[PDB]
Amino acid sequence: VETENIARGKQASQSSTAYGGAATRAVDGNVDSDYGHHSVTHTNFEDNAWWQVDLGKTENVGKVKLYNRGDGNVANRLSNFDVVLLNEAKQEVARQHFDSLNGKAELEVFFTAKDARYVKVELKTKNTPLSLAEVEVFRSAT
Numbered sequence: 001v002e003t004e005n006i007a008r009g010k011q012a013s014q015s016s017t018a019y020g021g022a023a024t025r026a027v028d029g030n031v032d033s034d035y036g037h038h039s040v041t042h043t044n045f046e047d048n049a050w051w052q053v054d055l056g057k058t059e060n061v062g063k064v065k066l067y068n069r070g071d072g073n074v075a076n077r078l079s080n081f082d083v084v085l086l087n088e089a090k091q092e093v094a095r096q097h098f099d100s101l102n103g104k105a106e107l108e109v110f111f112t113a114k115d116a117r118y119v120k121v122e123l124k125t126k127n128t129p130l131s132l133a134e135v136e137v138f139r140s141a142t
């Protein structure tokens with residue numbers, strides 16, 4: 001995959017915002033996973049919490065990398081979730097499910113050359129906030 005993180009600085013949004021956890025903190029170019037360092041997002045405790053970045057145009061995506069929150073012993077809030085790729089009309093072009101990160105600070109998701117404008121993370125769990133230290137997105141090679 002290419003090395004340019006194309007998610008950086010792009011428009012981000014999420015299902016709701018709590019504890020000041022702006023959606024843009026996931027694309028601010030800082031993977032620091034301590035919530036107190038202000039670079040981790042946070043939605044409400046709600047069902048099917050989601051976060052999304054708009055790449056701004058359609059890109060051939062090969063890799064999406066999630067960085068989990070690392071403080072407060074609440075890492076397992078990022079579990080039972082999908083990573084979704086949508087085209088410009090916001091239809092799904094790819095979707096992968098994950099049970100867990102297994103205590104890892106990060107997850108690399110590889111997509112098979114998918115042409116997508118939006119990258120979404122969706123929890124499938126009830127009454128759980130979504131918190132991401134960073135989401136990085138990389139174009140397929142060549």
Ligand SMILES: CC(=O)N[C@@H]1[C@@H](O[C@@H]2O[C@@H](C)[C@@H](O)[C@@H](O)[C@@H]2O)[C@H](O[C@@H]2O[C@H](CO)[C@H](O)[C@H](O)[C@H]2O[C@@H]2O[C@@H](C)[C@@H](O)[C@@H](O)[C@@H]2O)[C@@H](CO)O[C@H]1O
Nearest residue numbers: 018019020021034035036037038042071072073074129131
């Ligand atoms: C007091 C205040 O100004 N805000 C509190 C939160 O505390 C702030 O954010 C934390 C991440 C720390 O950086 C802390 O120093 C800072 O004041 C508070 O969060 C909890 O704070 C406690 C006690 O210090 C622990 O750090 C705990 O891990 C924090 O709770 C977690 O993070 C929250 C943001 C939520 O995700 C909670 O569900 C987690 O358990 C919160 C909650 O008590 O209240 C703010 O308004």
Ligand SMILES: [Ca+2]
Nearest residue numbers: 025030039133
């Ligand atoms: Ca960040």
Ligand code: NI
Nearest residue numbers: 034035036037
């Ligand atoms: Ni600190």
